Paper text:
The [name] protein functions in membrane trafficking and is critical for human neuronal development. [name] is a recently characterized member of the TBC family and is conserved in many eukaryotic taxa. In mammalian cells, [name] is localized on the trans-Golgi network (TGN) and functions as an adaptor to capture the incoming endosome-derived vesicles. Unlike many members of the TBC family, [name] lacks the catalytic Arg-Gln residues and unlikely functions as an active GAP.
After screening many different expression constructs, we were able to obtain diffraction-quality crystals of the [name] N-terminal region (D23N) consisting of residues 1–460 and encompassing both the TBC and rhodanese domains. The crystal structure of D23N was determined by selenium single-wavelength anomalous diffraction (Se-SAD) and refined to a resolution of 2.5 Å. Each crystallographic asymmetric unit contains one D23N molecule, and the final model contains residues 14–298 (TBC domain, cyan) and residues 316–460 (rhodanese domain, yellow), connected by a short loop (amino acids [aa] 297–315; gold color), which adopts a 310-helix within its N-terminus. The TBC and rhodanese domains tightly pack against each other and bury a total solvent-accessible surface area of 1,350 Å2. The two domains together adopt a V-shaped structure, with the TBC domain forming the base and one arm and the rhodanese domain the other arm. Similar to other TBC-containing proteins, the TBC domain of [name] only compromises α-helices, which can be further divided into two subdomains: the amino-terminal domains containing α1–α7 and a carboxy-terminal subdomain spanning α8–α16. The rhodanese domain of [name] adopts α/β topology typical of a single rhodanese domain. In contrast with CDC25B, the putative active-site cysteine residue C399 is localized in the middle of β2 strand of the β-sheet, and its side chain is solvent-inaccessible. Thus, our structural analysis indicates that the rhodanese domain of [name] is unlikely to be an active phosphatase or sulfurtransferase. D23N possesses several deep pockets lining the center of its surface, with pocket 1 and 2 being predominately hydrophobic and pocket 3 consisting of both aromatic and negative charged residues.
Numbering used by the authors: 17 to 460
Write the structure that this text describes.
Amino acid sequence: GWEKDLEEALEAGGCDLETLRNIIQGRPLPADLRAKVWKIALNVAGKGDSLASWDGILDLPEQNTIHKDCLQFIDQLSVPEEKAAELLLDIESVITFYCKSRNIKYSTSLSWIHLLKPLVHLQLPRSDLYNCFYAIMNKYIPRDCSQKGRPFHLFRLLIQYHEPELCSYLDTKKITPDSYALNWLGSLFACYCSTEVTQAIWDGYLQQADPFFIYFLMLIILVNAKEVILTQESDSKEEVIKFLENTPSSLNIEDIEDLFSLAQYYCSKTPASFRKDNHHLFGSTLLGIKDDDADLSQALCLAISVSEILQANQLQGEGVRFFVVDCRPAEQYNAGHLSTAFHLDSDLMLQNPSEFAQSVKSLLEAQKQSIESGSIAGGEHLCFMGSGREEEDMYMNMVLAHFLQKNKEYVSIASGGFMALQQHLADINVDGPENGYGHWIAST
C-alpha cells in the first residue's frame, strides 16, 4: 500500500525527507528504493561528481597504509572477484580525494573504511559514494571524534546523568568512553554490526536525521551490558574494554526496533540543552567560540541553559522538569534568588556538615512534595546553580561531588549560574511566567 506510494513519490517531484518519512512510518525500506531514500536523507539528490575535475592518480605520503586497509575490507566481504577490482579503485580514490580536498592526513585508527561498507553494499557509482560519505562525515560524525576529545566527554556526561552508578565504576577503573566506543561513534556501529542490522540502524538513523541520536543508541548498548560490567570485578581493565567494544556486534535485526524505542525513551528524559548547547561538535569548530568557559573536559555533569529551566517547568505536560537548587551563601541568596529554588547553603558543607546533611534531607523532601503538588518548582531533575562567577563557584565541585557519590540520577548544573539568569531575563525583558502572581527573581 505505502510501497507503491513510495515508488511514485521517489520517481518525480523532488520531494523532501519530511514527506517521505510520513509514507514509510518506520516500516522496512525496499532494497531497490533504499539508495534513493538514503540519497534524499543525506540531501544528495543530483549532486555532481567531484572526482572528474580532480583528474589525479593516487599519490600520498600515507598512500601505502591506505592500500592495505582497502584490501582488508574487500577480502573480508569476499565479493565476486570478477568486478572486485572496480570497487577497490573507487574506495581508494574516494579516501585519497577526501584526504586531498581537506587538509587532514590518513591513519588506520580512523573509522572511514567502516562508513563505506553499508554504502558499498547498496552498490552506487563513485560520485554518489563520495557525496554520501562526505555528507555523513560533516552531518553525523563529530569533528574531534578521531582525537578522542569533547564528543566522548559529552557521552560520559550522558551516562552519568542516567546511570550514575555505572559511570562511577567506569571512571574509577579509568575506562573512558573513547576506549570502547571510538568506532561506535566513528563508524555508526558499521565497524561491529553485520550488513543487515547496520542497514536497519542506518535506515532509521538517516530517516530521523538527528546528529545526537547516536549518543542515545550508544547509551542503550552500554546499559544493556550494565549487569555484566558491575558483577565481574575480577577481569582487568583491558579485558572489560575488549568485551564492551564488541557488544554492538551481538545485535540482531529483531533487536533494532527496541533499540530505537529505548533510545527515544532515554532521549525524552534528557534536557533539550544536551543537543542545543553542543551543535559545535558536528558543524564547524568556529561556532562554539561564543560559548566561552564551557569545556566538556572540565565538566563534572551536564550543563542546562537557563532558558530551558524557565520554559520546561511552565509546560507541565509529562516533560523534563527541574528542581532548582540555589547553592550560593545566604548573603548572595537573600540579595536576589530564583523564587522557585531551594536554598542549599554551600557554606554549611564544611563549616557545619550535620546541618548541611539536614538541609540535603529537607531538599529531597521538598523535591518530593513539589512533584506531588504539581507546582512550578517541582521536577525530577536536580539542577544546581551558583553565582556564575568562576571566582566563587569552587563549592559547586563539592556540592556536585556530594550528590554524584550517592549515585543521584539527573544531576545537572545551571549554565552561567544566577548571573546568567539575570542576564537572560534582562535580554528578553521578562519578569515572570505568563500564569501566576510572581516574578522569577525575588528578594524573599
